[PDB]
Amino acid sequence: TVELCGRWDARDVAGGRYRVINNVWGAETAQCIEVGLETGNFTITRADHDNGNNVAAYPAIYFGCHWGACTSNSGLPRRVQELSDVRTSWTLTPITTGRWNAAYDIWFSPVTNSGNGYSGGAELMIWLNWNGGVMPGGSRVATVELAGATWEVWYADWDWNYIAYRRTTPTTSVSELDLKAFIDDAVARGYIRPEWYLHAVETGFELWEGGAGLRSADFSVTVQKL
Known part of the structure; x- marks a missing residue:
């Protein structure tokens, strides 16, 4: 394993199929993750965050293209209308302190270049676990x-x-x-257009406060085109 503490540190894992990023994008507080290079499994070993109501970091593992940095032979970006099946697996180990979530972050946009982000596109999150009273942005519109x-x-x-x-x-x-x-549900609600491209499938932990001890394991993503 290797411990990554750099703000924008990363490692390609699993033969280049996935990439792990320390991604301390919202704060300057210290954070390290210890990464297994063959699987991409990682534990947050240090997280000094205490960021209030704003996300401090999102250590994550991803498949596809994150702000222009793409994994090896992902088949992405690909238009939503050209997707037939998209599956993923993940196992997380929760902790009982801190303010954080365990969530997928999936990015879409109308264009194929993601170097300047996803303005005009969409961010689809899937929250599986959390602690500390954190809630998603926006408003609850359905169940x-x-x-x-x-x-x-x-x-x-x-x-x-x-x-x-x-x-x-x-x-x-x-x-x-x-x-x-x-x-498909988001498309039906009008939040994502079929002509938009799926750029990346990521999962990890959004951290507001603390986070040391959280572990990400068994990540896998597969995409089948029509």
Whole structure:
């Protein structure tokens, strides 16, 4: 394993299929993650965050293209209308202190270049676990049954459309979760357009305060085109 403490530190893992990023994008407080290079599994070993109501960091593992940095042979970006199946697995280890969530962050945009971000596109989050009273951005607009569970749907109209599906009860693992079910729901609500591109599928922990001890493991993403 290797411990990464740099603000924008990263490592390609699993033969280049995925990439792990320390990603302390919202603060200057220290954070380190210890990463297994073959699997991408990681534990947050240090997290000095105490950021109030703003997210301090999002250590994560991803498949696809994150702000122009793409993993090896992901097949992304690809238009939503050209996707037939999108599945993912993940196992998280929660802690009982701090303010954080365990959530997928999935990015879409109308164009193929993601170097300047996803303005005019959408951010689709799937919250599986959390602690400390944190809540998604925007407002709760519905509660829906999807992919075997029930989820609150939160929406915010920002620079990009923010959509967060928050499980009604927390969980610590998913196996071959049908991400297309969530994409289809967001398309039906008008939050994502079929002509937009899916750029990246990421999962990790948004941290507001603390976070040391959280562990990410068993990550996998597969995408099948029509």
